[PDB]
Nucleic acid binder design. Sequence first.
RNA 1: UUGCGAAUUCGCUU
RNA 2: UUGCGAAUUCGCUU
Length: 271
Amino acid sequence: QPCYLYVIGMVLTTPLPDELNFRRRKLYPPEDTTRCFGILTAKPIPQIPHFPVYTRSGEVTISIELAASGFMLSLQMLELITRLHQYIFSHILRLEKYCVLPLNVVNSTLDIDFKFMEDIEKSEARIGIPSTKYTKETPFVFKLEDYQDAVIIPRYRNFDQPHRFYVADVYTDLTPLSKFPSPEYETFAEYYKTKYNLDLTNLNQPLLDVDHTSSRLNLLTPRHAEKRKAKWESLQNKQILVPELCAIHPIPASLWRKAVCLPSILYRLHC
RNA sequence: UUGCGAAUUCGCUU
RNA sequence: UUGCGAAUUCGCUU
C-alpha cells in the first residue's frame, strides 16, 4: 500500500504580548528548530485551511502540507514508526486511545527521522528514571550544551509517575553550596543530604530553573480550594534543581513543545 | 489557564 | 464487603 507523507508545519505568527505574559516566560517559536512532526497515511488528507493553536509562547498557525506521495515503506520501518506513534501518546503525553512521526531536514528537504527514532528506543531514559553511578573517581560531569534544549526528571522521587520539567534557565552563578531558600537548611547540598540521603560528586555545577511540562489537551482557544493548587503549582515553578540529581529526557524540549499541540491538531483534522 | 493525599461538615435516593 | 457532588482545615515540592 502506497504512502502519503504530510508535514505539520508550525509558525508563531503572533507572539504572546507583554500584558498576557503573566509568568514572564521566554518565547519559543517552533520554526526555530528544524525537527518537527508529520503524519503518515494510507489515504490522502483533504486540503484544510490554516488554523491556530494557542500556546505558552502565543498564537501558532498550523499548516498541513504534503511532503511526498505514492511511495513504499518497508515493514521494518512501519513497525518503527508505529511504536514511536504509541510512545508519544502514552509515555510522552500520557493519554489513552494513521501514524504521527518526527521529521527533520537531511542537510531544505524534510524527511522521516529514523535515527532520532532509534535513539529514543535505545535511551534508558525513554520510559523511567535510569540508574546512574556517580563516584569520586567518576563524578557527574556538567555539559552546558546538554541542558540547552532539555526536559529533565528528578531521579530521586516520584518513581511511580516521574515528573518532567523544561529546563527554563541555567544559573551559572549558583552551586549546590549556594544558600537554601528555606532557613532550616543552609545549602542545597545539605538539603538533599538531610532529606533524601543524597551525596553530590560535583560541587561546582550551576543549578537549574524549571517550568512544568503539563498542559490542557485543547488549545484551540486562548487561555485568556483551587487556591491550594495555585500555591502548589507556583512553588513547583520556583523550584531550583540540581543537574546531577536529574536525568535528561531523550525528547528535546523544543519538540516536546510541538508534541503537546498534537491532540489539538488531530482532533481538529478529524472533525 | 497544570496536582494526590488525609481529616471534617453537608446536599442528592424511598 | 457498592456511590457523585459541594464547601472547609491540613500534609507532601525547592
